[PDB]
Design a binder for this molecule. Sequence first.
Ligand SMILES: OC[C@H]1O[C@@H]2O[C@H]3[C@H](O)[C@@H](O)[C@@H](O[C@H]4[C@H](O)[C@@H](O)[C@@H](O[C@H]5[C@H](O)[C@@H](O)[C@@H](O[C@H]6[C@H](O)[C@@H](O)[C@@H](O[C@H]7[C@H](O)[C@@H](O)[C@@H](O[C@H]1[C@H](O)[C@H]2O)O[C@@H]7CO)O[C@@H]6CO)O[C@@H]5CO)O[C@@H]4CO)O[C@@H]3CO
Ligand code: CA
Ligand code: CA
Length: 866
Amino acid sequence: FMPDARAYWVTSDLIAWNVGESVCLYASRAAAMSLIQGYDSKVELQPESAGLPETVTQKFPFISSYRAFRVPSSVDVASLVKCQLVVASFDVTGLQLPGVLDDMFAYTGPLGAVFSEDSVSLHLWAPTAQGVSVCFFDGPAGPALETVQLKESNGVWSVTGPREWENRYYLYEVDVYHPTKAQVLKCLAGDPYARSLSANGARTWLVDINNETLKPASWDELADEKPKLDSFSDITIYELHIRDFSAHDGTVDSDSRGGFRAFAYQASAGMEHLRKLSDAGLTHVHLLPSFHFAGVDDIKSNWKFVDECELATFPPGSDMQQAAVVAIQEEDPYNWGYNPVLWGVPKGSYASDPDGPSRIIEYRQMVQALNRIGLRVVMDVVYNHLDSSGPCGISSVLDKIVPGYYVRRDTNGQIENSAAMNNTASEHFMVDRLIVDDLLNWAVNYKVDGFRFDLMGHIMKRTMMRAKSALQSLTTDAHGVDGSKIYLYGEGWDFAEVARNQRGINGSQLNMSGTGIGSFNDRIRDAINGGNPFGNPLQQGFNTGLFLEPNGFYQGNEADTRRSLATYADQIQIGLAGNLRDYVLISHTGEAKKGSEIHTFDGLPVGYTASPIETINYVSAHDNETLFDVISVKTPMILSVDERCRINHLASSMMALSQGIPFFHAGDEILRSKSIDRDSYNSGDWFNKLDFTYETNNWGVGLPPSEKNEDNWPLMKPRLENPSFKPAKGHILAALDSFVDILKIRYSSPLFRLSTANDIKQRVRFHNTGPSLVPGVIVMGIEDARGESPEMAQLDTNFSYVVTVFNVCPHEVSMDIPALASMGFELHPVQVNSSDTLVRKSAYEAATGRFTVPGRTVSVFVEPRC
Ligand SMILES: OC[C@H]1O[C@@H]2O[C@H]3[C@H](O)[C@@H](O)[C@@H](O[C@H]4[C@H](O)[C@@H](O)[C@@H](O[C@H]5[C@H](O)[C@@H](O)[C@@H](O[C@H]6[C@H](O)[C@@H](O)[C@@H](O[C@H]7[C@H](O)[C@@H](O)[C@@H](O[C@H]1[C@H](O)[C@H]2O)O[C@@H]7CO)O[C@@H]6CO)O[C@@H]5CO)O[C@@H]4CO)O[C@@H]3CO
Ligand SMILES: [Ca+2]
Ligand SMILES: [Ca+2]
């Protein structure tokens, strides 16, 4: 006897059901109804003629067609939402309650644990629960000492106790009806507003987050020690995985590797690396999920490893490495961590001790340690889905307390798994509150500097906007953090059930235009690399040999590939200009077009932003092939690793010198490889190695785990086994040196970092365009106040003009730019002192404004004011 849920209880007095041209509601407290009988109460619903109110349809657009039914006043709603409910016609079905729950029980009062000099109080939102109690434990594994009943007041359960409650461990015992089991079950659950947990979150630790003993030395002075940030336009991002950082770092003692503590090792190879990029100009470091997620056991004694020495003896293109890693993947210390369980607590496995304060203290110490070397900290936040749901499981918490509320459901009442599994419903009040609250927890209690939203397109826009004002209004005097400096960005993908605003206006790329919130520019990524993560891996792009260097894979005639190369070049140039929708570019057809007037391969605007700070330019990230791996797959095999080394630099240089916000994947600068693994979320330390000795880049360490790569093994094997694909220390260091220099160039002039669209439209121009453009060359010019009586403000005191030439051709080129004739252009001082002998041969001839640039080279020219 388990009916689905095709009816909706949207308001205290309205029920929406999509029946056709006698409807009754049934309620059983003990959940004993069967096919309609065994009910405790019965009431008939009067068909509404005015239909659903605008508030309902605007909150739940996908049911604006449903028929409306009115619930009598005699009906006690608060009591019914606790019982089992169905509805029948004269077809039977259950009810989805989020609507009415919000209508009647929307709560803004204290949640979780509150502390006073005299007492401690607990608060839990569970409007459907029939009873809530708290079990107290004395330790992480001790027996239950005491059980205390909580009183419900407006769907919120509370209780107050002596201050001796502090430091106790506890769990809620919730008595709720679960739709998936059609039973009233008594489950144990952690606190959604937990601030700390025992190992694996088995219990909640009743700790005071403001306790002085949880603060590193000088913690309250961190606001004063934070790296300065004049504008969001100055931001550069470096995406790093906490374990990847030190797992293989021999300079950090064995025990302290792989977690938060490793960052306290100032003089380690890894930290010296971050310090080097920081001194170069890198502002922000984006850490992969560091909250409480499933997939990694917090108990280190349970961890298992592979024989790193044995696997090192296997052949480069063997399948033995992955078979060994896969064999223990479910029990190793590794995982990206995209499996949310509790959002407001640091991951136990990254702490020195899962039980106690170490996870709190060490996290702060990590934030402080990164701030002290000039780096602000960004958290990878995943509010779009949950690891688990239902009554059973240590990894299920939210859906255990208020079943069917925190998770998004289809029209049949079944849970949506679009995001991965157990999609969240940010469109629900208390879900929205939980998200904004969690953000404030990290910004204030941990002094985090920014947030990257995973699957931002699955989050309501209003949630994103309400969070943005709450975070940016934080002040040093009231909170100890400067909220105005906090930056937000995320994946604005629009797909599945949230597409076309079906669940309301979501945080997609097009909806976030003009919000000041950044989104990943997938347009410039695909144009540079070629194709897309869903297409043929051999599809070539602007920076991977399209037309100029065919790889063998058939992609049309010379005329077609040449045309496509030009098309990609247009998208890249729009992205270089901040990916603005109103920026006017001379397209390859010769016709002038705005960024929004140029369309993607599937018919949507390439440029879609209203500001440069809304675009996150990139060519690589944690997911999909690494930069080095994608280049080694798409370019012709005949190419040497020496030439590919330059191809890598071209890619990251295009990001480092583009308007908007450059985003770098940890390893780009050192040719990092995952041996061509396209989804290394679960591939262990072996395939995710970050070698800071610079001896290797992890290329040719066997084929990648078959689960996600087996269908491309034939393509990888020959390349992995080919010794001429493997870079040596020399190459890696060279890559790192030239990467550093490019950062220095971005921060040597404010012209690379224009703050508004108006400024970009006025100063940024491209000089190699039209139907007769030289293939494989991009010439970007940036103007500043020149001569007397300028229509601009002098933004740069050193240069009055800046020209950048991107040459992806194998051969040297000479670009005649008459507009820039008879000027004082010199090779950038940083490139004149470059260790790359090639770029130093860049020249400029005044009489014709000719710029001579070597092949596979990016050359920056400037015009001194002095
Ligand atoms: O979602 C299922 C998907 O999950 C995983 O994919 C990741 C992926 O690794 C990430 O890179 C990212 O993808 C982003 C893209 O970065 C972004 O460009 C955009 O993609 C758009 C594409 O540009 C466009 O081509 C189109 O994609 C279509 C596509 O034509 C179809 O082939 C089909 O794709 C399916 C795949 O073929 C299939 O393998 C599987 O993919 C998994 C995958 O296993 C995993 O790595 O399912 C998909 C979906 O059915 O359909 C799509 C969409 O109709 O349109 C997209 C979006 O407008 O956005 C994506 C995110 O969707 O994130 C995904 C998911 O986290
Ligand atoms: Ca810095
Ligand atoms: Ca794993």
